[PDB]
Design a protein around this ligand. Structure first.
Ligand SMILES: Nc1ncnc2c1ncn2[C@@H]1O[C@H](COP(=O)(O)OP(=O)(O)NP(=O)(O)O)[C@@H](O)[C@H]1O
Length: 277
């Protein structure tokens, strides 16, 4: 069967690809693969864009080297990446930990609401992962945090942050200058700046999504209206639907327009909402 047809391999024979398509987006196709060295299944991802400039691919090679030496139990593990030659163009392959239980976003669609104990636990694990990344030397900023790339190991398991280090390549992809997902992007990111606090802003919106089970700014007609609102400090309408005042208050501190007024991650971890139990 399916697991007997290895239709691709890394140069070393470590990773094998099976013709089992497990998902597809506009950036990436994901296939089930095998790590022959540990026997664990992995996610073998193939980038849709086969016309990235030499310079884009070179920069990503340097990025993948750093990603390959980072590990934390709340971060989806990055194993390797290389360029395969498929047809007429350089197809980039990434191999990552296989996540078998979907995302926070699909969890919210399935269960409709998140219980406040589950919220607290998962938000705390996201915060530990970000805090790990922010305290490396040098610091690593994710830049593209959202509910869609936060994975779970099971409905009562643990959270892993996905897509670390792919924001530059996602921007290059199809030469479209996509900077991120408007709903989660701090105001300063449209001026081409980022610091650690963009991740605090995005964490705040993830928390807003988990507390309300709706996408932030779903009232907005398009990304332009979101841009205008965020860069004048107009909150998403869902902020007033937040039912737990402590939660509301954390979200408020995370999404402040002025980056310097936002909570630090350490502030967040010591908050009574998280520090309790
Ligand atoms: N490590 C993983 N293990 C298993 N499935 C994954 C993994 N990473 C992504 N997927 C799934 O593969 C599908 C496509 O991934 P996704 O990240 O939506 O694609 P994308 O092209 O990067 N982004 P977008 O264009 O915004 O959809 C989604 O259903 C993901 O849940």
């Amino acid at each position: 069967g399916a697991m007997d047809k290895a239709v691709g391999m890394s140069n070393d024979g470590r990773f094998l690809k099976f013709d089992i398509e497990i998902g597809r987006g506009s950036f990436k196709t994901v296939y089930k693969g095998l790590d022959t060295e540990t026997t664990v299944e992995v996610a073998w991802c193939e980038l849709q864009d086969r016309k990235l400039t030499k310079s884009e691919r070179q920069r990503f090679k340097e990025e993948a080297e750093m990603l390959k030496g980072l590990q934390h139990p709340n971060i989806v593990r990055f194993y390797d990446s290389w360029e395969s030659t498929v047809k007429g163009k350089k197809c980039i392959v990434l191999v990552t930990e296989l996540m078998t239980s979907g995302t926070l976003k699909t969890y919210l669609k399935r269960f409709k609401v998140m219980k406040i104990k589950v919220l607290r636990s998962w938000c705390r694990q996201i915060l530990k992962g970000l805090q790990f990344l922010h305290t490396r030397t040098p610091p690593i900023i994710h830049r593209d945090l959202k509910c869609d790339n936060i994975f779970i190991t099971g409905p009562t398991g643990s959270v892993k942050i996905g897509d670390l280090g792919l924001a530059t390549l996602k921007r290059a992809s199809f030469a479209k200058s996509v900077i991120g997902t408007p709903e989660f992007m701090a105001p300063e990111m449209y001026e081409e700046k980022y610091d650690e606090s963009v991740d605090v802003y995005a964490f705040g919106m993830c928390m807003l999504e988990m507390a309300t089970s709706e996408y932030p700014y779903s009232e907005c007609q398009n990304a332009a209206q979101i841009y205008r609102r965020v860069t004048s400090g107009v909150k998403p309408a869902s902020f007033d639907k937040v039912a737990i005042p402590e939660v509301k208050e954390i979200i408020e501190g995370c999404i402040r327009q002025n980056k310097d007024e936002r909570y630090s991650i350490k502030d967040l971890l010591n908050h009574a909402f998280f520090q309790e139990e």
